Amino acid sequence: RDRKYLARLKLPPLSKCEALRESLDLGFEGMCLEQPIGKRLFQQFLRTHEQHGPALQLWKDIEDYDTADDALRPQKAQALRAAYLEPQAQLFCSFLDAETVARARAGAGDGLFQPLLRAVLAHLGQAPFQEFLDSLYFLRFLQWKWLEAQPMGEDWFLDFRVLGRGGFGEVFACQMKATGKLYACKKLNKKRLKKRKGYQGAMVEKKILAKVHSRFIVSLAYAFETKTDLCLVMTIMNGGDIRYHIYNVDEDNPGFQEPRAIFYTAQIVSGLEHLHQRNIIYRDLKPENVLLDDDGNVRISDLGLAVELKAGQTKTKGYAGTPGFMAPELLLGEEYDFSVDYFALGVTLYEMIAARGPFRARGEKVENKELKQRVLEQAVTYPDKFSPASKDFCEALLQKDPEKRLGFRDGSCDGLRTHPLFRDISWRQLEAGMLTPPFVPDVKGVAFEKADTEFFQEFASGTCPIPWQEEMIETGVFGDLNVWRP
Amino acid sequence: RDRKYLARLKLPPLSKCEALRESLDLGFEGMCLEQPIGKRLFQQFLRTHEQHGPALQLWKDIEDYDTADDALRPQKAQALRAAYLEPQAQLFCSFLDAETVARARAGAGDGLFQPLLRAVLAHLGQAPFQEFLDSLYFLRFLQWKWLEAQPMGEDWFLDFRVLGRGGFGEVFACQMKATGKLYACKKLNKKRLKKRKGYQGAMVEKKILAKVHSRFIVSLAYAFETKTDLCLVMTIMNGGDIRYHIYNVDEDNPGFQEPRAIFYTAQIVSGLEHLHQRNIIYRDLKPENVLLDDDGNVRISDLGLAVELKAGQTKTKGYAGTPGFMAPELLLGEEYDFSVDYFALGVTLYEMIAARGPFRARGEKVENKELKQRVLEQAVTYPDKFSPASKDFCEALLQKDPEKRLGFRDGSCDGLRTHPLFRDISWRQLEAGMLTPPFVPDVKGVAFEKADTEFFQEFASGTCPIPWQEEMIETGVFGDLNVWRP
């Protein structure tokens, strides 16, 4: 971990933060719930003001309950009602209207104290937040926000191994010099990008990865440019992709035992739900695009083919994707939904179990025209490796007509999580990354004009707030720079 | 210690401090050296900024040297030159011009690193201070300054014993309810004060005690008013006055053994020097006005007869004082100096040793006219209880002609500290209250008009900055209210 760079992270004089005190969203949930550092500084304020003690403690306890092993839930719920909900107890929460306290008292299932937590946060967003804004803790948040906006480009990162190769350049495992955090840096050589008309794709990816924060999508931390390249510094995923893992590990016995395959399906499904909730269509889901991190958790990646539906827009058109994964509606030149992605999910689960595609034989290579016809009118065949459940799930995803295809209804995939295939999957624990993964790894003549440079600048948009604050915190740097009296 | 009142000490929202951010002196030495809390907060800033580390540590070390037992001085000076003055050492102070470093390197006596310290503080007053002002630490100082200005009057103090009786009311030992700190509250019934024309005297005292900060003058902490009284909350002195101690403890063998008497004289002399340095003439020094605290240290008190010389004024006129202590020049109706006080010092040391006055016999009571003549023309007589030194000192203070009287020359009493009488007195340790004391204890028809109410308001000027910050600190309240992360 480089000391010269560590030393460039130093909180500024308050006078330097006056400007970005206007260019900043004051919004409560925006800054105190979503930004890791704001949340940390706002909980600190709370901890040092008696009045708010109970609310802070309840809040903290709820998140503790939401992350507890199922075994400990009953008692944590017990102590929680005892500690904040009996009008006796010291930490009773008088700001909770009795109707809310009643419900919280009578415990349902998963989502038990969710409506409690919403009431607590609704409370904190009023005076407590308004007080925070009038406290030193808020001024500290502005200092941090200032350091976050400072330039941290190429000289800040040390490449030290190739993770893979891609259309426009290599992908390196690299270190952020100050903090020593490990990332993946994806390079896109500038000249090739122009030569091959790939600006739209490159940008769609950067914007998606920046504005999306899921443990199942790879996450963008930084975006800058060099003499030669555009760069995307993002979550490092060191455990190879699903497709590698299907064919290349167990060579003579290709495939996944159902449970493992289901685990991934479940994680991937969570990846889609997030994209679709933000009106994004992936358009490119497949084994080769799904990566494993060191622990054996999985994230979707590679998003050059994605599209963002403009607000109010529900359907779109356009040929795009990988042959053998594009769904019927797309091929028929029709306008399509998120449904497209679910068809791809199905092809994917299928491949994970059968170590082969549904639409061709091993080595069988056909013309596009023919592959198209198979996808459109060929009924899929399910060998014995499949279990009733698997088979049925794949049938529901691979439904030729999107109107009849298992997918995304009512702003979620809840309908889908229901399926008998996910019988042994605790969605709570999965969504929170707290389940044990079933498997743990071990050119000539281009001239740059005005429009080219503009594009580059718009691409190199600098640091991504949430992931940077995460890094500062995980890496210890926040604790160190934040001390008041040593 | 009262919890209801403790709870009224809570730092305010920054917005409430905007106003007193103009009505405040920014001055460096004024806020960071003289105000205990500003100093504490400014050292905190310093501790949390690497660059300033060396300067802060030097500063701290010097005060440590200035308070060390004489036994430890040599080595502390050693480690000090080793740690900040050799260009090698980590904590070397590059901001010290070499000429200063040279002098500091070659050690004299008492006052060794004084000119070093002045250079360190001169440094801190520049950028470091200017940075402080742009830091959160300065904003915290504004919060504290806000709490300090909040109303803390009679309901904030619990009387619980009479310490003594005075012309206009009693003096009580009382507790500051919030902090539990013990004070003396001196009451002046409002009606009597008016009836007997005592407003000037009462005020002269309050202003003197407020604007003066010495360990040898009693110290004013608060000044407020009740329905019936004006109030002065001040240092508590529980060990009786010198005059009580002269006659009333050892009844049949009245007096002080020289060393004890010298100790007091030395303390008292320090009391005068402060008063004179601020152009104040005491006019009322005497055994009955000199108090003992619990440890047996001594402070001068009772200041209704004092006068403050307007700036540029060097001499004054006016009959005032206690018969038997007023000096010749004063009696002769002439205009007088601080010299007056030194004559009183002399009568005082004399009484401490002889258990009698120099000018009359036991029980001898004469007319003013006669007592005057004795003071003016009677030569003093020194029994055997006196040592050459004592006798000589008293002769020098009791000199009828102020032009020839030992006293206050060149802005100090250094000339006087020189005397052979103080041969065994370490002035350094005395001035710092770190010596072991030789003895350790165990009405009708008055109507209030406009002018009366105005006077009262001007008198009840509230809390005294320095002593309040001291209290907050000693009493632990500052530590508690100042925490950043618990």
Ligand SMILES: Nc1ncnc2c1ncn2[C@@H]1O[C@H](COP(=O)(O)OP(=O)(O)O)[C@@H](O)[C@H]1O
């Ligand atoms: N976040 C990452 N962590 C580790 N390796 C990666 C990461 N992203 C990509 N790679 C490696 O780089 C390859 C190409 O990256 P990708 O973004 O898929 O390029 P393209 O979009 O040009 O196909 C991947 O197959 C993978 O092996």
Ligand SMILES: Nc1ncnc2c1ncn2[C@@H]1O[C@H](COP(=O)(O)OP(=O)(O)O)[C@@H](O)[C@H]1O
């Ligand atoms: N700070 C104090 N601590 C303890 N006792 C005190 C203090 N101030 C006054 N007293 C007691 O109360 C008496 C009267 O106080 P004083 O200020 O001398 O009033 P006055 O000016 O009317 O003489 C003193 O003689 C002393 O015994």
Ligand SMILES: [Mg+2]
């Ligand atoms: Mg790829």
Ligand SMILES: [Mg+2]
């Ligand atoms: Mg791509």
Ligand SMILES: [Mg+2]
């Ligand atoms: Mg008195």
Ligand SMILES: [Mg+2]
């Ligand atoms: Mg008086």
